[PDB]
Enzyme design. Structure first.
Site, mmCIF file in Angstrom:
data_model
loop_
_atom_site.group_PDB
_atom_site.id
_atom_site.type_symbol
_atom_site.label_atom_id
_atom_site.label_comp_id
_atom_site.label_asym_id
_atom_site.label_seq_id
_atom_site.Cartn_x
_atom_site.Cartn_y
_atom_site.Cartn_z
ATOM 1 N N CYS B 65 -35.151 -39.876 1.102
ATOM 2 C CA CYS B 65 -35.165 -38.376 0.848
ATOM 3 C C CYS B 65 -35.897 -37.653 2.026
ATOM 4 O O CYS B 65 -36.937 -37.967 2.151
ATOM 5 C CB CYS B 65 -35.775 -37.999 -0.363
ATOM 6 S SG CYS B 65 -35.806 -36.204 -0.646
ATOM 7 N N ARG B 68 -38.608 -34.488 1.000
ATOM 8 C CA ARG B 68 -39.999 -34.629 0.459
ATOM 9 C C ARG B 68 -41.168 -33.667 0.580
ATOM 10 O O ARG B 68 -42.165 -33.861 -0.262
ATOM 11 C CB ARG B 68 -40.307 -36.079 0.335
ATOM 12 C CG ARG B 68 -39.355 -37.081 -0.223
ATOM 13 C CD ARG B 68 -39.872 -38.249 0.018
ATOM 14 N NE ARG B 68 -39.242 -38.985 1.382
ATOM 15 C CZ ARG B 68 -40.012 -40.196 2.048
ATOM 16 N NH1 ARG B 68 -40.973 -40.776 1.318
ATOM 17 N NH2 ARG B 68 -39.450 -40.319 3.054
ATOM 18 N N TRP B 237 -31.973 -28.679 -3.899
ATOM 19 C CA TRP B 237 -30.888 -27.876 -3.358
ATOM 20 C C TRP B 237 -30.282 -28.769 -2.233
ATOM 21 O O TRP B 237 -30.867 -29.837 -1.753
ATOM 22 C CB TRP B 237 -31.203 -26.639 -2.797
ATOM 23 C CG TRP B 237 -32.366 -26.848 -1.968
ATOM 24 C CD1 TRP B 237 -32.291 -27.094 -0.803
ATOM 25 C CD2 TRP B 237 -33.853 -26.624 -1.995
ATOM 26 N NE1 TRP B 237 -33.393 -27.413 0.084
ATOM 27 C CE2 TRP B 237 -34.413 -26.726 -0.922
ATOM 28 C CE3 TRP B 237 -34.548 -26.026 -3.271
ATOM 29 C CZ2 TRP B 237 -36.051 -26.679 -0.838
ATOM 30 C CZ3 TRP B 237 -35.815 -25.809 -3.085
ATOM 31 C CH2 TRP B 237 -36.336 -26.207 -1.908
ATOM 32 N N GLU B 242 -24.343 -32.765 3.549
ATOM 33 C CA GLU B 242 -23.975 -33.619 2.367
ATOM 34 C C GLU B 242 -22.386 -33.026 1.894
ATOM 35 O O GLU B 242 -21.666 -34.143 1.410
ATOM 36 C CB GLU B 242 -25.070 -33.382 1.387
ATOM 37 C CG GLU B 242 -26.302 -34.019 1.511
ATOM 38 C CD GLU B 242 -27.251 -33.765 0.305
ATOM 39 O OE1 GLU B 242 -27.003 -34.564 -0.724
ATOM 40 O OE2 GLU B 242 -28.136 -32.877 0.229
HETATM 41 C C1 HEM Z 1 -35.336 -29.943 -2.690
HETATM 42 C C2 HEM Z 1 -34.296 -30.362 -2.170
HETATM 43 C C3 HEM Z 1 -33.843 -31.404 -1.611
HETATM 44 C C4 HEM Z 1 -33.259 -31.944 -0.403
HETATM 45 C C5 HEM Z 1 -32.477 -30.870 0.446
HETATM 46 C C6 HEM Z 1 -32.888 -33.309 -0.519
HETATM 47 C C7 HEM Z 1 -32.292 -33.917 0.544
HETATM 48 C C8 HEM Z 1 -31.858 -35.329 0.370
HETATM 49 C C9 HEM Z 1 -30.593 -35.621 0.868
HETATM 50 C C10 HEM Z 1 -29.734 -35.076 1.868
HETATM 51 C C11 HEM Z 1 -30.625 -36.939 0.541
HETATM 52 C C12 HEM Z 1 -29.257 -37.977 0.988
HETATM 53 C C13 HEM Z 1 -28.389 -37.923 -0.128
HETATM 54 C C14 HEM Z 1 -27.101 -38.799 0.246
HETATM 55 O O1 HEM Z 1 -26.962 -38.956 1.351
HETATM 56 O O2 HEM Z 1 -26.412 -39.315 -0.770
HETATM 57 C C15 HEM Z 1 -31.765 -37.343 -0.586
HETATM 58 C C16 HEM Z 1 -31.594 -38.519 -1.321
HETATM 59 C C17 HEM Z 1 -32.521 -38.519 -2.187
HETATM 60 N N1 HEM Z 1 -33.365 -37.756 -2.821
HETATM 61 FE FE1 HEM Z 1 -33.760 -35.815 -1.963
HETATM 62 N N2 HEM Z 1 -33.553 -33.862 -1.533
HETATM 63 C C18 HEM Z 1 -34.165 -32.862 -2.178
HETATM 64 C C19 HEM Z 1 -34.902 -32.737 -3.603
HETATM 65 C C20 HEM Z 1 -34.793 -34.116 -4.145
HETATM 66 C C21 HEM Z 1 -35.441 -34.387 -5.540
HETATM 67 C C22 HEM Z 1 -36.010 -33.048 -6.256
HETATM 68 C C23 HEM Z 1 -35.799 -35.406 -5.915
HETATM 69 C C24 HEM Z 1 -36.272 -36.043 -7.112
HETATM 70 C C25 HEM Z 1 -37.356 -35.575 -7.878
HETATM 71 C C26 HEM Z 1 -35.079 -36.212 -4.843
HETATM 72 C C27 HEM Z 1 -34.914 -37.757 -4.822
HETATM 73 C C28 HEM Z 1 -34.142 -38.189 -3.843
HETATM 74 C C29 HEM Z 1 -33.531 -39.558 -4.020
HETATM 75 C C30 HEM Z 1 -33.778 -40.482 -5.043
HETATM 76 C C31 HEM Z 1 -32.776 -39.756 -3.187
HETATM 77 C C32 HEM Z 1 -31.870 -41.172 -2.917
HETATM 78 C C33 HEM Z 1 -30.380 -41.303 -3.526
HETATM 79 C C34 HEM Z 1 -29.725 -42.497 -3.245
HETATM 80 O O3 HEM Z 1 -30.438 -43.549 -2.902
HETATM 81 O O4 HEM Z 1 -28.543 -42.569 -3.655
HETATM 82 N N3 HEM Z 1 -34.716 -35.237 -3.815
HETATM 83 N N4 HEM Z 1 -32.324 -36.356 -0.561
HETATM 84 N N1 LIG Z 2 -29.783 -32.376 -2.058
HETATM 85 C C1 LIG Z 2 -29.979 -33.602 -2.890
HETATM 86 C C2 LIG Z 2 -31.125 -33.610 -3.546
HETATM 87 C C3 LIG Z 2 -31.187 -34.904 -4.344
HETATM 88 C C4 LIG Z 2 -30.269 -35.887 -4.063
HETATM 89 C C5 LIG Z 2 -30.380 -37.340 -4.714
HETATM 90 C C6 LIG Z 2 -29.479 -38.228 -4.655
HETATM 91 C C7 LIG Z 2 -28.040 -37.975 -3.910
HETATM 92 C C8 LIG Z 2 -27.436 -38.958 -3.955
HETATM 93 C C9 LIG Z 2 -26.006 -38.440 -4.235
HETATM 94 N N2 LIG Z 2 -24.851 -39.519 -4.546
HETATM 95 C C10 LIG Z 2 -23.957 -39.845 -3.633
HETATM 96 C C11 LIG Z 2 -22.755 -40.582 -3.962
HETATM 97 C C12 LIG Z 2 -22.957 -41.541 -5.100
HETATM 98 C C13 LIG Z 2 -22.108 -42.259 -5.672
HETATM 99 C C14 LIG Z 2 -20.667 -42.096 -4.934
HETATM 100 C C15 LIG Z 2 -20.569 -41.422 -3.666
HETATM 101 F F1 LIG Z 2 -19.377 -41.655 -3.131
HETATM 102 C C16 LIG Z 2 -21.701 -40.722 -3.272
HETATM 103 C C17 LIG Z 2 -28.217 -36.766 -3.283
HETATM 104 C C18 LIG Z 2 -29.233 -35.762 -3.301
HETATM 105 N N3 LIG Z 2 -29.097 -34.670 -2.782
HETATM 106 CL CL LIG Z 3 -23.385 -35.018 -3.613
#
Ligand code: HEM
Ligand SMILES: Nc1ccc2ccc(CCNCc3cccc(F)c3)cc2n1
Ligand SMILES: [Cl-]
Ligand code: HEM
Ligand SMILES: Nc1ccc2ccc(CCNCc3cccc(F)c3)cc2n1
Ligand SMILES: C[C@H](O)[C@H](O)[C@H]1CNc2nc(N)[nH]c(=O)c2N1
Ligand SMILES: C[C@H](O)[C@H](O)[C@H]1CNc2nc(N)[nH]c(=O)c2N1
Ligand SMILES: [Cl-]
Lengths: 362, 362
Positions: B65, B68, B237, B242
């Protein structure tokens, strides 16, 4: 321990090399000759066939290289015969000439004598045979910052740059027994350069950007079957992003994105306008256009990735394990638009291979 | 072995949690209560303070993420009291409403009762609370391909999509004791959507693209001190890439780059024209512009990376080790223009954290 490392690496190389060359029946006898040679001399000498195929395998095993499809067409020049600095100079001059090939670049490696007791016969200081100088003093930045330390070292040795943004560094290398390297100015008739223009935007030439045609990396060690070829310069042709997305774009390099934005007529004020991204695309379009126009070989990152996919397919078909460094294989422009981004690679080190070695300056 | 894993994870969490909260003197007594509770009941119950801080730590430890920096401002809703599917439905409805906040998105997590003996109390099938359906049959592709299997599962349960490219999936979840999940259509008054227009190119609206405002991920497990919160939907947000570089751009998603190239008036014929790169930039500019225009929170990848740099600095200052996944942290657009690209990250898993879990469909 030295000798055992040599013998163990030799067995693995000769076996695999001769298997690939259909010379499997010759392994046993060749290993015998090598084993005697190692006991008697402390080292062993590759045949022309082993050296050529060894350098090709080394390219094939380069995890960070996207251009590996063409590993088997590498042009290998054996210069293990050189003994004088004039011979080294002329070998380097020849490499530039034959690799450039009037713009139709031939991937080439020139192989100099290897280390003996870890003692280098020839020690090349240049990172690349053709590279621009860099200067930094009293806030004044000129040229390529990545060349600042080598430039300063050259100027310690009697050389002086004109302090343009594109001074060609001289060749600089040291022979076994000499305390200081010698330097030779590059004949400009050997160096192809490409002025950067844009296909649609006439003002792009106001930037007066250019780059050199052929990247000839000359500070990596080729390792083949336990033998350390510390001096073995090689070249491919450029992928456009190397020039447009990094060399000319990085803040710690030429840092041209703000000037690009200005000449293409967009504001460079707001992150949300994505002006850096747009500037990166136009600069990279200009680089490909310019090289193509001049008749100098180059590849775009999309074509290169498609070729790399074929390399992956070729490996599986040949029954060879594929290794790669995902972090280096993805292009710095639109990586998610390539297949590379969407799979994983095993980053294990397989030999023969090319390795980093310590800089004799710095 | 179950119980020891629980007790060991609990000690580590409570210690670190109470240290951070300045409650270090209370650790000894709290661990005693927990230890008795585990022996007597088989599990333990977090205080409101532990749960809130635990979910925040889990965000802080999410290696992939980039957002963070704002970990400590997460809005934590404790719904461990729910027992009925109507209560779950209303909790999910409320989450959408309060997180959306009329466009000024509040990062929020709603926490449902945890697993007991690995037995789920509530099991949410949606990947995100708001997500588009996907269809595939006889070569006919409609909607979001990433939703094809969940869509088919919903249509097994009596639901039917209109088969537009943007059908909203119903909420679908299963309660402990029920064999089948129930589904509830989303009230459209709760769902903010953004039509994609371009700041300079009027024809961009011919594509009739749109996306939903708030990504609310609802199929990850929150793990805090040995307790498994399998049902705990959360949201931030969007970062623009994305939507513009992946959701709308991937060949295995909406695959819009050729249509984008057409409306922005460039040829999509030659790799060397870098038309995909140019189309990616304009589409990503359109996404940021559109969300901004509608008053829905969003961040660009440059600003987001700058914020992440501050997160790195904050971590070092607080004396906490930094962990991250380089391959996920770099944006899919101009990654080398961010600082992230030029350093490395330790990808060790630290708990509390959010984890993948098996899909109950498929
Ligand atoms: C506040 C705005 C936030 C932004 C802009 C942001 C941005 C991102 C982005 C761009 C990703 C990559 C997602 C992808 O490529 O599929 C990501 C992954 C992630 N974010 Fe954030 N995030 C935010 C808030 C949060 C919050 C609130 C949480 C949880 C409390 C969180 C937990 C995660 C997790 C767990 C992933 C990994 C998901 C996965 O492995 O599939 N994020 N974040
Ligand atoms: N802006 C954010 C904030 C938190 C997030 C947490 C997790 C993800 C992962 C979104 N999952 C993407 C995905 C999941 C499954 C199939 C596929 F093609 C794509 C995006 C976030 N994006
Ligand atoms: Cl998405
Ligand atoms: C034929 C055209 C070639 C192309 C387009 C190509 C492409 C690339 C690119 C883009 C890189 C990344 C460089 C960087 O980011 O700094 C790379 C790395 C590399 N290539 Fe190739 N390459 C080619 C030929 C060769 C040849 C002929 C060799 C050697 C025989 C080679 C060996 C390597 C090595 C060793 C690296 C890694 C360098 C390092 O770690 O710093 N490549 N290649
Ligand atoms: N097209 C090719 C082919 C082969 C290559 C082999 C190595 C490299 C690495 C170039 N070194 C980049 C660099 C080296 C040192 C400092 C710095 F800023 C940048 C590029 C290649 N590029
Ligand atoms: C195989 C590879 O890990 C995969 O394509 C990853 C790469 N990096 C990523 N990074 C982000 N942010 N999101 C993703 O979906 C992916 N996909
Ligand atoms: C720290 C990180 O490994 C470093 O910035 C790498 C990332 N990937 C790269 N990939 C290529 N092709 N070239 C590079 O110089 C780098 N730099
Ligand atoms: Cl280079």
């Amino acid at each position: 321990e030295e000798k055992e490392i040599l013998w163990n690496e030799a067995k693995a190389f000769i076996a695999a090399c001769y298997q690939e060359l259909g010379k499997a029946a010759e392994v046993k006898d060749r290993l015998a000759d090598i084993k005697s040679e190692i006991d008697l001399t402390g080292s062993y000498v590759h045949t022309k066939e082993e050296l050529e195929h060894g350098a090709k395998m080394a390219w094939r095993n380069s995890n960070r290289c996207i251009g590996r499809l063409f590993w088997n067409s590498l042009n290998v020049i054996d210069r293990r015969d050189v003994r004088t600095k004039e011979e080294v100079r002329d070998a380097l001059f020849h490499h530039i000439e034959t690799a450039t090939n009037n713009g139709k670049i031939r991937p080439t490696i020139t192989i100099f004598p290897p280390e003996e007791k870890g003692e280098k016969q020839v020690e090349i200081w240049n990172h690349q045979l053709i590279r621009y100088a860099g200067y930094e003093s009293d806030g004044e930045r000129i040229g390529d910052p990545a060349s600042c330390s080598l430039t300063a070292a050259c100027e310690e040795l009697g050389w002086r740059g004109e302090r343009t943004d594109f001074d060609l560094l001289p060749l600089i290398f040291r022979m076994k027994g000499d305390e200081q390297p010698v330097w030779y100015e590059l004949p400009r008739s050997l160096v192809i350069e490409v002025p950067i223009t844009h296909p649609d935007i006439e003002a792009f030439s106001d930037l007066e950007l250019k780059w050199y045609g052929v990247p000839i990396i000359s500070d990596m060690k080729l390792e083949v079957g336990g033998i350390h070829y510390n001096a073995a310069p090689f070249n491919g042709w450029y992928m456009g992003t190397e020039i447009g997305a990094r060399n000319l774009a990085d803040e710690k390099r030429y840092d041209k994105l703000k000037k690009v934005a200005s000449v293409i007529g967009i504001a460079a004020d707001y992150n949300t306008d994505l002006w850096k991204d747009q500037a990166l695309v136009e600069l990279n379009k200009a680089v490909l256009h310019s090289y193509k126009k001049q008749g100098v070989s180059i590849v775009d990152h999309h074509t290169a990735a498609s070729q790399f996919k074929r390399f992956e397919e070729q490996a599986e078909e040949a029954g060879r394990k594929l290794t790669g460094d995902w972090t280096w294989l993805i292009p710095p422009i639109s990586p998610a638009a390539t297949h590379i981004f969407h799979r994983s690679y095993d980053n294990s080190i397989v030999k023969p291979n090319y390795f980093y070695q310590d800089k004799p300056y710095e």
